[PDB]
Amino acid sequence: SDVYAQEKQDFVQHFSQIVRVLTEEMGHPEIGDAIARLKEVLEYNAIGGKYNRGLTVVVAFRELVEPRKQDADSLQRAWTVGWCVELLQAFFLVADDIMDSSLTRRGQICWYQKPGVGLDAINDANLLEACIYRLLKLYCREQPYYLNLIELFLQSSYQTEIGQTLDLLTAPQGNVDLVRFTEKRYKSIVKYKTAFYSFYLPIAAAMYMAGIDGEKEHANAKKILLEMGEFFQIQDDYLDLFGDPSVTGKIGTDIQDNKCSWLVVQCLQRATPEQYQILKENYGQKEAEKVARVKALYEELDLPAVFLQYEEDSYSHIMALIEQYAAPLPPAVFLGLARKIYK
Amino acid sequence: SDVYAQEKQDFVQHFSQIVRVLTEEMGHPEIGDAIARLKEVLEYNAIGGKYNRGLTVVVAFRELVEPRKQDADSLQRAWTVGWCVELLQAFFLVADDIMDSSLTRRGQICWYQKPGVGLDAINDANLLEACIYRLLKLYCREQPYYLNLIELFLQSSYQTEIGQTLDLLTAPQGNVDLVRFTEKRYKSIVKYKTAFYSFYLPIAAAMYMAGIDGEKEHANAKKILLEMGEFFQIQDDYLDLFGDPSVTGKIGTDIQDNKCSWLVVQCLQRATPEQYQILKENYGQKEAEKVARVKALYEELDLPAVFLQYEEDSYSHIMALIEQYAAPLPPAVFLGLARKIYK
Ligand SMILES: Cc1ccc(-c2cc3c(N[C@@H](Cc4ccccc4)P(=O)(O)O)ncnc3s2)cc1Cl
Ligand SMILES: Cc1ccc(-c2cc3c(N[C@@H](Cc4ccccc4)P(=O)(O)O)ncnc3s2)cc1Cl
Ligand SMILES: Cc1ccc(-c2cc3c(N[C@@H](Cc4ccccc4)P(=O)(O)O)ncnc3s2)cc1Cl
Ligand SMILES: Cc1ccc(-c2cc3c(N[C@@H](Cc4ccccc4)P(=O)(O)O)ncnc3s2)cc1Cl
């Protein structure tokens, strides 16, 4: 019994309540059609993932709040904030999929590729962001942690946008970018692109909902959860190329799109001058033959083997960090995450 | 002496302070390059308009706050919130210009058309939105009206996104859309697309900064300022086609892009069955010959003459509304706006 698997059904049943509430703007019929589009956008975009971000809010809330203080209303609010993290994710996916020229995401066609959508998806993305603060207001405005949450969601959006900015600056389309594919850069991107919103946001949200706002207590959780995010994104980079797309649900574009991948960084640290030139001639181009040559060089440098060795050392390191920095929180908050992202 | 013309210089000099403060993330050098991109985005996007939104915050603040309560610090905060409205505008412009396939805006090439930008502009737009809440925090977090402002900016973003959603649903590319070009629809779009953020937001912001949070006092200002926004957008639609682009600064795309324009609505209300078919065969297509045929039909129905007659009746109506609903606020708050948007 994973604490996630158990709390999942109740979380998904709540979604209908989220949608019913964000569409009922019933005293405003003039915008009826727009609420219909909003409903379509949520059903397509916020559904069909494993929900691990939002569930993490709901799990962590159960582990942190004295069970006497778990009234039906307090639960609603945890389900909602969890959903708020999912909406945040759906905002970044919809928009990132346009920017990266993605085909597919979680097994179906990307929202912007659906006929009759295209660049209108920009506006659709923006609405998904809007919906967060509409829910925080409708469910948490009388709560003492309300402002803390609003500030947490916006700070998380700013840091992800900063991370996306680095990702894009490091990966100019059409140009040879290998010079700027460094470890220092790589760590910076993933810290800001992924780690803050995927790991810190959901735990931090639950922490606040439990009246734990201590600056040192948020610093210490952050110190664990950012390293968890670093490993997670390194695995996302690994699976972008070597994953099984009946599992990953998406096609890898990192080579064609010219991304500062963990893989390309590792490959640069190991290449002969000769191998550098294979990579230089083949990386960052839409041609299937050139993406194949890169995968072949990665496999010749046994990077999948280097990834397996990093997944080992990372697990040990992360565990040593939960020793150092979990207290006073139940270690189970952290361990439940580690269980979910190391197979 | 327009109260706007006078307060302008001081407002623009402040911009350098906005940029210095949002880039000084000086204890975070790893994201240096991203702050550089942020700086470029602000200089290109938030500069070269007439600033009327943001100035309206600063004017209204002077008219509403007892001059004893106008300390140097209280001014900084008014300049900042004003700038916050400008950043909001710059967010919607950058993104709307991608969606509408705009060439130019305020006399220069659209940000997304600049070589090496393209769809990365989506992320750039998102950062401009982020910057608002970064400034509200840095300048207003200790103020009693802080939450009121955060809620005001987000509500304004949601209503604009709803309005954009209606605009897009009413204007499907490739299809004949004349059926859905009604007055009821037209008014709904502009209320939500333009009026809330262009008129209500800046006055409402100043009102809050002056401790005026009364529900009836915000209802009454809103009642005036939304009708001002309706007229403003009807004039924006008129100038989209009949404007002087050394004045308007932008090329009109409303015909090619298939927009529920005031012009197309008025034209539909007046056409012979025959003229309907000219419009039906020529509206919503990229071909210069078909956009020319539409302008010719508009000119044959003396719509520019109908626009002049509406600009008359609107001015009278708006003035009768400031009679009814300005109190207890100085009428000058409202009149200063009317002066700025009727020539
Ligand atoms: C979460 C997690 C998931 C998978 C692993 C794996 C480790 C490993 C392995 N490790 C050897 C070392 C190794 C061998 C080949 C390639 C990389 C490392 P060992 O340390 O001698 O057991 N050899 C073959 N397959 C595997 S899978 C470790 C962890 Cl901590
Ligand atoms: C904060 C957070 C963010 C994302 C996740 C995800 C985990 C996961 C997954 N994990 C599987 C395990 C796993 C499979 C392959 C590689 C790594 C872990 P599970 O054990 O079925 O949950 N399999 C597919 N997609 C995802 S997304 C988990 C968390 Cl706690
Ligand atoms: C803010 C503002 C800006 C311009 C106008 C104009 C009105 C008008 C006009 N009005 C005539 C009526 C009219 C004539 C032709 C076309 C439309 C209306 P009138 O009422 O007899 O003076 N005839 C020619 N030119 C103009 S410009 C009115 C307003 Cl209150
Ligand atoms: C809330 C708000 C939003 C936008 C505006 C704008 C006004 C304006 C303008 N007005 C000129 C007058 C004018 C010119 C043509 C048509 C209408 C008014 P001005 O008198 O020089 O300020 N000329 C070009 N662009 C703009 S944008 C003003 C406000 Cl008080």
PDB file of N, CA and C in Angstrom, chain B residues 144-219:
ATOM      1  N   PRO B 144      -1.601  47.955   3.997  1.00  0.00           N
ATOM      2  CA  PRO B 144      -2.894  47.321   4.281  1.00  0.00           C
ATOM      3  C   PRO B 144      -3.730  46.896   3.061  1.00  0.00           C
ATOM      4  N   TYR B 145      -3.423  47.424   1.877  1.00  0.00           N
ATOM      5  CA  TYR B 145      -4.189  47.197   0.618  1.00  0.00           C
ATOM      6  C   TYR B 145      -3.482  46.160  -0.276  1.00  0.00           C
ATOM      7  N   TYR B 146      -2.424  45.523   0.231  1.00  0.00           N
ATOM      8  CA  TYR B 146      -1.542  44.602  -0.528  1.00  0.00           C
ATOM      9  C   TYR B 146      -2.386  43.480  -1.139  1.00  0.00           C
ATOM     10  N   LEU B 147      -3.002  42.628  -0.329  1.00  0.00           N
ATOM     11  CA  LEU B 147      -3.902  41.546  -0.811  1.00  0.00           C
ATOM     12  C   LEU B 147      -4.932  42.112  -1.798  1.00  0.00           C
ATOM     13  N   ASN B 148      -5.589  43.229  -1.487  1.00  0.00           N
ATOM     14  CA  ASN B 148      -6.619  43.858  -2.361  1.00  0.00           C
ATOM     15  C   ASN B 148      -6.057  44.020  -3.779  1.00  0.00           C
ATOM     16  N   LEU B 149      -4.832  44.564  -3.902  1.00  0.00           N
ATOM     17  CA  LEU B 149      -4.108  44.744  -5.193  1.00  0.00           C
ATOM     18  C   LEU B 149      -3.862  43.372  -5.855  1.00  0.00           C
ATOM     19  N   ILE B 150      -3.323  42.390  -5.136  1.00  0.00           N
ATOM     20  CA  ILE B 150      -2.977  41.067  -5.737  1.00  0.00           C
ATOM     21  C   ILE B 150      -4.247  40.466  -6.340  1.00  0.00           C
ATOM     22  N   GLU B 151      -5.336  40.525  -5.585  1.00  0.00           N
ATOM     23  CA  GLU B 151      -6.670  40.018  -5.989  1.00  0.00           C
ATOM     24  C   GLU B 151      -7.161  40.802  -7.199  1.00  0.00           C
ATOM     25  N   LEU B 152      -6.953  42.129  -7.221  1.00  0.00           N
ATOM     26  CA  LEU B 152      -7.397  43.030  -8.329  1.00  0.00           C
ATOM     27  C   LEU B 152      -6.683  42.689  -9.645  1.00  0.00           C
ATOM     28  N   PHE B 153      -5.360  42.552  -9.610  1.00  0.00           N
ATOM     29  CA  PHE B 153      -4.547  42.190 -10.794  1.00  0.00           C
ATOM     30  C   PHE B 153      -4.956  40.798 -11.308  1.00  0.00           C
ATOM     31  N   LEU B 154      -5.103  39.801 -10.443  1.00  0.00           N
ATOM     32  CA  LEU B 154      -5.441  38.432 -10.900  1.00  0.00           C
ATOM     33  C   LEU B 154      -6.867  38.446 -11.465  1.00  0.00           C
ATOM     34  N   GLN B 155      -7.824  39.114 -10.801  1.00  0.00           N
ATOM     35  CA  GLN B 155      -9.237  39.122 -11.272  1.00  0.00           C
ATOM     36  C   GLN B 155      -9.228  39.758 -12.660  1.00  0.00           C
ATOM     37  N   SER B 156      -8.434  40.800 -12.830  1.00  0.00           N
ATOM     38  CA  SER B 156      -8.364  41.558 -14.100  1.00  0.00           C
ATOM     39  C   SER B 156      -7.798  40.640 -15.204  1.00  0.00           C
ATOM     40  N   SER B 157      -6.774  39.841 -14.904  1.00  0.00           N
ATOM     41  CA  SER B 157      -6.181  38.834 -15.827  1.00  0.00           C
ATOM     42  C   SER B 157      -7.201  37.751 -16.214  1.00  0.00           C
ATOM     43  N   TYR B 158      -7.905  37.179 -15.240  1.00  0.00           N
ATOM     44  CA  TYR B 158      -8.991  36.198 -15.509  1.00  0.00           C
ATOM     45  C   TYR B 158     -10.047  36.820 -16.444  1.00  0.00           C
ATOM     46  N   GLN B 159     -10.519  38.030 -16.175  1.00  0.00           N
ATOM     47  CA  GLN B 159     -11.627  38.582 -16.989  1.00  0.00           C
ATOM     48  C   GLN B 159     -11.125  38.846 -18.409  1.00  0.00           C
ATOM     49  N   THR B 160      -9.862  39.242 -18.577  1.00  0.00           N
ATOM     50  CA  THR B 160      -9.295  39.560 -19.922  1.00  0.00           C
ATOM     51  C   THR B 160      -9.159  38.249 -20.710  1.00  0.00           C
ATOM     52  N   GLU B 161      -8.639  37.215 -20.066  1.00  0.00           N
ATOM     53  CA  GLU B 161      -8.535  35.852 -20.636  1.00  0.00           C
ATOM     54  C   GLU B 161      -9.933  35.325 -21.014  1.00  0.00           C
ATOM     55  N   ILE B 162     -10.944  35.523 -20.179  1.00  0.00           N
ATOM     56  CA  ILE B 162     -12.340  35.148 -20.550  1.00  0.00           C
ATOM     57  C   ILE B 162     -12.752  35.904 -21.824  1.00  0.00           C
ATOM     58  N   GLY B 163     -12.484  37.211 -21.903  1.00  0.00           N
ATOM     59  CA  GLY B 163     -12.847  38.080 -23.045  1.00  0.00           C
ATOM     60  C   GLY B 163     -12.151  37.638 -24.329  1.00  0.00           C
ATOM     61  N   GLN B 164     -10.833  37.341 -24.240  1.00  0.00           N
ATOM     62  CA  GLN B 164      -9.994  36.761 -25.327  1.00  0.00           C
ATOM     63  C   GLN B 164     -10.630  35.438 -25.820  1.00  0.00           C
ATOM     64  N   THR B 165     -11.022  34.559 -24.889  1.00  0.00           N
ATOM     65  CA  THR B 165     -11.723  33.287 -25.160  1.00  0.00           C
ATOM     66  C   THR B 165     -12.972  33.584 -25.994  1.00  0.00           C
ATOM     67  N   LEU B 166     -13.801  34.547 -25.606  1.00  0.00           N
ATOM     68  CA  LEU B 166     -15.016  34.849 -26.415  1.00  0.00           C
ATOM     69  C   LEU B 166     -14.602  35.337 -27.804  1.00  0.00           C
ATOM     70  N   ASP B 167     -13.613  36.232 -27.859  1.00  0.00           N
ATOM     71  CA  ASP B 167     -13.100  36.846 -29.113  1.00  0.00           C
ATOM     72  C   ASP B 167     -12.733  35.712 -30.076  1.00  0.00           C
ATOM     73  N   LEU B 168     -11.904  34.771 -29.613  1.00  0.00           N
ATOM     74  CA  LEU B 168     -11.431  33.600 -30.399  1.00  0.00           C
ATOM     75  C   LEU B 168     -12.611  32.711 -30.813  1.00  0.00           C
ATOM     76  N   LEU B 169     -13.503  32.319 -29.896  1.00  0.00           N
ATOM     77  CA  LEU B 169     -14.682  31.447 -30.196  1.00  0.00           C
ATOM     78  C   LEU B 169     -15.578  32.088 -31.248  1.00  0.00           C
ATOM     79  N   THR B 170     -15.660  33.416 -31.260  1.00  0.00           N
ATOM     80  CA  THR B 170     -16.538  34.191 -32.175  1.00  0.00           C
ATOM     81  C   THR B 170     -15.864  34.319 -33.551  1.00  0.00           C
ATOM     82  N   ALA B 171     -14.523  34.210 -33.601  1.00  0.00           N
ATOM     83  CA  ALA B 171     -13.676  34.411 -34.805  1.00  0.00           C
ATOM     84  C   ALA B 171     -12.877  33.157 -35.216  1.00  0.00           C
ATOM     85  N   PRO B 172     -13.520  31.989 -35.462  1.00  0.00           N
ATOM     86  CA  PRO B 172     -12.796  30.834 -36.003  1.00  0.00           C
ATOM     87  C   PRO B 172     -12.170  31.090 -37.401  1.00  0.00           C
ATOM     88  N   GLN B 173     -10.829  30.964 -37.492  1.00  0.00           N
ATOM     89  CA  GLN B 173     -10.021  31.061 -38.744  1.00  0.00           C
ATOM     90  C   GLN B 173     -10.571  30.034 -39.742  1.00  0.00           C
ATOM     91  N   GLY B 174     -10.626  30.415 -41.015  1.00  0.00           N
ATOM     92  CA  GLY B 174     -11.041  29.528 -42.110  1.00  0.00           C
ATOM     93  C   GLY B 174     -12.546  29.495 -42.303  1.00  0.00           C
ATOM     94  N   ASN B 175     -13.351  29.736 -41.260  1.00  0.00           N
ATOM     95  CA  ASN B 175     -14.833  29.588 -41.365  1.00  0.00           C
ATOM     96  C   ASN B 175     -15.508  30.950 -41.602  1.00  0.00           C
ATOM     97  N   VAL B 176     -16.758  30.931 -42.098  1.00  0.00           N
ATOM     98  CA  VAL B 176     -17.704  32.086 -42.210  1.00  0.00           C
ATOM     99  C   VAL B 176     -18.424  32.249 -40.873  1.00  0.00           C
ATOM    100  N   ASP B 177     -18.277  33.412 -40.239  1.00  0.00           N
ATOM    101  CA  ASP B 177     -18.592  33.619 -38.806  1.00  0.00           C
ATOM    102  C   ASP B 177     -19.683  34.686 -38.643  1.00  0.00           C
ATOM    103  N   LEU B 178     -20.264  35.187 -39.738  1.00  0.00           N
ATOM    104  CA  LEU B 178     -21.135  36.402 -39.751  1.00  0.00           C
ATOM    105  C   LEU B 178     -22.353  36.184 -38.847  1.00  0.00           C
ATOM    106  N   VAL B 179     -22.818  34.935 -38.747  1.00  0.00           N
ATOM    107  CA  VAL B 179     -24.017  34.533 -37.955  1.00  0.00           C
ATOM    108  C   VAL B 179     -23.831  34.990 -36.500  1.00  0.00           C
ATOM    109  N   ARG B 180     -22.613  34.864 -35.966  1.00  0.00           N
ATOM    110  CA  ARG B 180     -22.299  35.006 -34.515  1.00  0.00           C
ATOM    111  C   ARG B 180     -21.834  36.439 -34.207  1.00  0.00           C
ATOM    112  N   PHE B 181     -21.785  37.310 -35.229  1.00  0.00           N
ATOM    113  CA  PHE B 181     -21.407  38.744 -35.117  1.00  0.00           C
ATOM    114  C   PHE B 181     -22.631  39.578 -34.726  1.00  0.00           C
ATOM    115  N   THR B 182     -23.074  39.465 -33.471  1.00  0.00           N
ATOM    116  CA  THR B 182     -24.249  40.176 -32.895  1.00  0.00           C
ATOM    117  C   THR B 182     -23.783  41.295 -31.965  1.00  0.00           C
ATOM    118  N   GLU B 183     -24.656  42.252 -31.661  1.00  0.00           N
ATOM    119  CA  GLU B 183     -24.344  43.353 -30.709  1.00  0.00           C
ATOM    120  C   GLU B 183     -24.116  42.752 -29.308  1.00  0.00           C
ATOM    121  N   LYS B 184     -25.071  41.928 -28.830  1.00  0.00           N
ATOM    122  CA  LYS B 184     -25.039  41.301 -27.477  1.00  0.00           C
ATOM    123  C   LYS B 184     -23.640  40.682 -27.308  1.00  0.00           C
ATOM    124  N   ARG B 185     -23.222  39.859 -28.258  1.00  0.00           N
ATOM    125  CA  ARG B 185     -21.885  39.219 -28.234  1.00  0.00           C
ATOM    126  C   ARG B 185     -20.804  40.300 -28.197  1.00  0.00           C
ATOM    127  N   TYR B 186     -20.866  41.264 -29.130  1.00  0.00           N
ATOM    128  CA  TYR B 186     -19.850  42.338 -29.273  1.00  0.00           C
ATOM    129  C   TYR B 186     -19.615  42.979 -27.908  1.00  0.00           C
ATOM    130  N   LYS B 187     -20.678  43.449 -27.249  1.00  0.00           N
ATOM    131  CA  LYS B 187     -20.597  44.156 -25.929  1.00  0.00           C
ATOM    132  C   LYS B 187     -19.913  43.247 -24.891  1.00  0.00           C
ATOM    133  N   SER B 188     -20.305  41.962 -24.844  1.00  0.00           N
ATOM    134  CA  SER B 188     -19.725  40.949 -23.928  1.00  0.00           C
ATOM    135  C   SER B 188     -18.214  40.870 -24.141  1.00  0.00           C
ATOM    136  N   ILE B 189     -17.804  40.775 -25.391  1.00  0.00           N
ATOM    137  CA  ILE B 189     -16.360  40.569 -25.659  1.00  0.00           C
ATOM    138  C   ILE B 189     -15.616  41.759 -25.040  1.00  0.00           C
ATOM    139  N   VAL B 190     -16.048  42.989 -25.349  1.00  0.00           N
ATOM    140  CA  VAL B 190     -15.188  44.178 -25.091  1.00  0.00           C
ATOM    141  C   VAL B 190     -15.220  44.470 -23.585  1.00  0.00           C
ATOM    142  N   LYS B 191     -16.376  44.249 -22.958  1.00  0.00           N
ATOM    143  CA  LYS B 191     -16.509  44.338 -21.485  1.00  0.00           C
ATOM    144  C   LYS B 191     -15.373  43.538 -20.831  1.00  0.00           C
ATOM    145  N   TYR B 192     -15.156  42.301 -21.273  1.00  0.00           N
ATOM    146  CA  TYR B 192     -14.269  41.319 -20.591  1.00  0.00           C
ATOM    147  C   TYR B 192     -12.846  41.390 -21.150  1.00  0.00           C
ATOM    148  N   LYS B 193     -12.714  41.648 -22.455  1.00  0.00           N
ATOM    149  CA  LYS B 193     -11.425  41.732 -23.192  1.00  0.00           C
ATOM    150  C   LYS B 193     -10.627  42.987 -22.792  1.00  0.00           C
ATOM    151  N   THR B 194     -11.284  44.137 -22.597  1.00  0.00           N
ATOM    152  CA  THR B 194     -10.626  45.477 -22.616  1.00  0.00           C
ATOM    153  C   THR B 194     -11.009  46.367 -21.431  1.00  0.00           C
ATOM    154  N   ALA B 195     -12.311  46.482 -21.168  1.00  0.00           N
ATOM    155  CA  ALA B 195     -12.880  47.472 -20.235  1.00  0.00           C
ATOM    156  C   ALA B 195     -12.346  47.226 -18.812  1.00  0.00           C
ATOM    157  N   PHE B 196     -12.385  45.985 -18.288  1.00  0.00           N
ATOM    158  CA  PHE B 196     -11.976  45.685 -16.888  1.00  0.00           C
ATOM    159  C   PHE B 196     -10.533  46.177 -16.709  1.00  0.00           C
ATOM    160  N   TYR B 197      -9.572  45.773 -17.535  1.00  0.00           N
ATOM    161  CA  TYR B 197      -8.129  45.998 -17.233  1.00  0.00           C
ATOM    162  C   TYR B 197      -7.689  47.400 -17.670  1.00  0.00           C
ATOM    163  N   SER B 198      -8.330  47.977 -18.687  1.00  0.00           N
ATOM    164  CA  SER B 198      -7.922  49.293 -19.256  1.00  0.00           C
ATOM    165  C   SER B 198      -8.491  50.469 -18.447  1.00  0.00           C
ATOM    166  N   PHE B 199      -9.692  50.322 -17.885  1.00  0.00           N
ATOM    167  CA  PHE B 199     -10.442  51.382 -17.174  1.00  0.00           C
ATOM    168  C   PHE B 199     -10.593  51.033 -15.689  1.00  0.00           C
ATOM    169  N   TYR B 200     -11.222  49.921 -15.324  1.00  0.00           N
ATOM    170  CA  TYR B 200     -11.498  49.625 -13.894  1.00  0.00           C
ATOM    171  C   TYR B 200     -10.183  49.401 -13.137  1.00  0.00           C
ATOM    172  N   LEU B 201      -9.361  48.465 -13.588  1.00  0.00           N
ATOM    173  CA  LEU B 201      -8.106  48.101 -12.876  1.00  0.00           C
ATOM    174  C   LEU B 201      -7.390  49.364 -12.374  1.00  0.00           C
ATOM    175  N   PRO B 202      -6.956  50.322 -13.214  1.00  0.00           N
ATOM    176  CA  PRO B 202      -6.081  51.382 -12.727  1.00  0.00           C
ATOM    177  C   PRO B 202      -6.770  52.283 -11.680  1.00  0.00           C
ATOM    178  N   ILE B 203      -8.061  52.570 -11.849  1.00  0.00           N
ATOM    179  CA  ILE B 203      -8.809  53.476 -10.940  1.00  0.00           C
ATOM    180  C   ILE B 203      -8.986  52.728  -9.620  1.00  0.00           C
ATOM    181  N   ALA B 204      -9.485  51.495  -9.707  1.00  0.00           N
ATOM    182  CA  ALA B 204      -9.687  50.566  -8.568  1.00  0.00           C
ATOM    183  C   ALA B 204      -8.390  50.413  -7.770  1.00  0.00           C
ATOM    184  N   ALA B 205      -7.241  50.337  -8.439  1.00  0.00           N
ATOM    185  CA  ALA B 205      -5.931  50.177  -7.763  1.00  0.00           C
ATOM    186  C   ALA B 205      -5.678  51.406  -6.890  1.00  0.00           C
ATOM    187  N   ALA B 206      -5.755  52.584  -7.498  1.00  0.00           N
ATOM    188  CA  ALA B 206      -5.602  53.871  -6.797  1.00  0.00           C
ATOM    189  C   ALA B 206      -6.623  53.948  -5.646  1.00  0.00           C
ATOM    190  N   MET B 207      -7.887  53.588  -5.888  1.00  0.00           N
ATOM    191  CA  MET B 207      -8.966  53.649  -4.869  1.00  0.00           C
ATOM    192  C   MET B 207      -8.534  52.892  -3.605  1.00  0.00           C
ATOM    193  N   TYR B 208      -8.087  51.649  -3.781  1.00  0.00           N
ATOM    194  CA  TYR B 208      -7.604  50.746  -2.706  1.00  0.00           C
ATOM    195  C   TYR B 208      -6.410  51.398  -1.999  1.00  0.00           C
ATOM    196  N   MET B 209      -5.465  51.972  -2.756  1.00  0.00           N
ATOM    197  CA  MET B 209      -4.227  52.586  -2.195  1.00  0.00           C
ATOM    198  C   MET B 209      -4.626  53.773  -1.304  1.00  0.00           C
ATOM    199  N   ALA B 210      -5.874  54.229  -1.425  1.00  0.00           N
ATOM    200  CA  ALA B 210      -6.420  55.372  -0.668  1.00  0.00           C
ATOM    201  C   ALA B 210      -7.424  54.879   0.376  1.00  0.00           C
ATOM    202  N   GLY B 211      -7.389  53.588   0.698  1.00  0.00           N
ATOM    203  CA  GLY B 211      -8.222  52.973   1.746  1.00  0.00           C
ATOM    204  C   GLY B 211      -9.698  52.966   1.389  1.00  0.00           C
ATOM    205  N   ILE B 212     -10.065  53.289   0.138  1.00  0.00           N
ATOM    206  CA  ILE B 212     -11.477  53.229  -0.347  1.00  0.00           C
ATOM    207  C   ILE B 212     -11.708  51.841  -0.922  1.00  0.00           C
ATOM    208  N   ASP B 213     -12.284  50.959  -0.118  1.00  0.00           N
ATOM    209  CA  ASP B 213     -12.558  49.555  -0.488  1.00  0.00           C
ATOM    210  C   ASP B 213     -14.069  49.316  -0.441  1.00  0.00           C
ATOM    211  N   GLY B 214     -14.884  50.333  -0.176  1.00  0.00           N
ATOM    212  CA  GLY B 214     -16.346  50.169  -0.086  1.00  0.00           C
ATOM    213  C   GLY B 214     -16.854  49.406  -1.294  1.00  0.00           C
ATOM    214  N   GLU B 215     -17.712  48.404  -1.104  1.00  0.00           N
ATOM    215  CA  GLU B 215     -18.259  47.584  -2.217  1.00  0.00           C
ATOM    216  C   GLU B 215     -19.098  48.478  -3.149  1.00  0.00           C
ATOM    217  N   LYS B 216     -19.966  49.342  -2.600  1.00  0.00           N
ATOM    218  CA  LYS B 216     -20.850  50.237  -3.403  1.00  0.00           C
ATOM    219  C   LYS B 216     -19.977  51.288  -4.112  1.00  0.00           C
ATOM    220  N   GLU B 217     -18.879  51.721  -3.486  1.00  0.00           N
ATOM    221  CA  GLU B 217     -18.023  52.777  -4.089  1.00  0.00           C
ATOM    222  C   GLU B 217     -17.279  52.160  -5.299  1.00  0.00           C
ATOM    223  N   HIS B 218     -16.945  50.860  -5.276  1.00  0.00           N
ATOM    224  CA  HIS B 218     -16.226  50.181  -6.395  1.00  0.00           C
ATOM    225  C   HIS B 218     -17.218  49.823  -7.494  1.00  0.00           C
ATOM    226  N   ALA B 219     -18.438  49.458  -7.113  1.00  0.00           N
ATOM    227  CA  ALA B 219     -19.566  49.187  -8.032  1.00  0.00           C
ATOM    228  C   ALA B 219     -19.857  50.423  -8.877  1.00  0.00           C
TER     229      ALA B 219
END
